[PDB]
């Protein structure tokens, strides 16, 4: 129906938009630093905690990409994410600089503890651990907030932080179909993966742009889950992990892959 790159073509996201599902009624946070003001992204919520206040809308570029990767509106113009509308929020938790303080990632994982809706993505990973961050995830599970942190981009035999832990799932990138990408990171705690070697999406200034990375493919799984919760607005982040677990493809292996490809066709059907 819409025009999407091989990235969304393998996430069975169209077949879902054709079945009748719209993920409408769900809520997902986007911990980034700018979702770019665009007619394809409907800002339903947003809060900037980290210092350096550029603008609740736009300030870098990646953030906006993750936005359409979670629910780029389906108006036919521009790309098409997995979700059409849904409540796409904007939790500027990081600064356009490159990585807010732990007081930012913590205040962002705690502000979602209350208004963190049912889902929340974290396309970040600092090598600096902190119990302040654990106190934030503590506020996230205390209320039940499904988090799907990304992987990284090649760095030691481990994944992002928290990603690895914090009750946050960690996503990874893939190659041609499912093989391990070339710059995707790995570790003993990978949750899922997807195609992250080229992904055209929206951009500020009324323009679109293509980029490659596991950060873009991370919110692709975050959106798929959104559609699930939609079909079941009474379920919880737990019951959801079930459907998404047995629905998401399952390469196999002992832990490297173990569920790595996603498809809303088996999650909606």
From Swiss-Prot:
Full-protein positions shown: 112 to 380 of 380
Gene Ontology CC terms, in alphabetical order: extracellular region
Residues given in the record as Ca(2+) 1 binding sites: 2, 40, 73, 75, 77, 79
Keyword tags: Calcium, Hydrolase, Metal-binding, Protease, Secreted, Serine protease, Signal, Zymogen
Phylogenetic lineage: Bacteria, Bacillati, Bacillota, Bacilli, Bacillales
Cofactors required: Ca(2+)
Residues at the catalytic site: 32 (charge relay system), 62 (charge relay system), 215 (charge relay system)
Gene Ontology BP term (one): proteolysis
Name of this protein: Alkaline protease
Cofactor note: Binds 2 calcium ions per subunit.
Cell compartments where the protein resides: Secreted
Taxonomic superkingdom: Bacteria
Residues covered by the Peptidase S8 domain: 5-268
Keyword Hydrolase in annotation: yes
UniProt-listed Enzyme Commission number(s): 3.4.21.-
Binding-site positions, Ca(2+) 2: 163, 165, 168
Organism whose genome encodes this protein: Alkalihalobacillus alcalophilus (Bacillus alcalophilus)
């Amino acid at each position: 129906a819409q025009s999407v790159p091989w990235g969304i073509s393998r996430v069975q996201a169209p077949a879902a938009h054709n079945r009748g599902l719209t993920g409408s009624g769900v809520k997902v946070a986007v911990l980034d630093t700018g979702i770019s003001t665009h007619p394809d992204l409907n800002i339903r919520g947003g809060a900037s905690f980290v210092p350096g206040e550029p603008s609740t809308q736009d300030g870098n570029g990646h953030g906006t990409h993750v936005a359409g990767t979670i629910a780029a509106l389906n108006n036919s113009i521009g790309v098409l994410g997995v979700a059409p509308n849904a409540e796409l929020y904007a939790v500027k938790v990081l600064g356009a600089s490159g990585s807010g303080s732990v007081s930012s990632i913590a205040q962002g994982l705690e502000w979602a503890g209350n208004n963190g809706m049912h889902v929340a993505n974290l396309s970040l990973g600092s090598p600096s651990p902190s119990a302040t961050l654990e106190q934030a995830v503590n506020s996230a599970t205390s209320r039940g907030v499904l988090v799907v942190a990304a992987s990284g981009n090649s760095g030691a035999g481990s994944i992002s932080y928290p990603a690895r832990y914090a009750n946050a799932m960690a996503v990874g990138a893939t190659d041609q179909n499912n093989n391990r990408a070339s710059f995707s990171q790995y570790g003993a705690g990978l949750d899922i993966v997807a195609p992250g070697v080229n992904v055209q999406s929206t951009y500020p200034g009324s323009t679109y742009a293509s980029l490659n990375g596991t950060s873009m493919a991370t919110p692709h799984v975050a959106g798929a889950a959104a559609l699930v919760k939609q079909k079941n607005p009474s379920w919880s982040n737990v019951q959801i992990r079930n459907h998404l677990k047995n629905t998401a493809t399952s390469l196999g292996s002992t832990n490297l892959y173990g569920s790595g490809l996603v498809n809303a066709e088996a999650a909606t059907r």
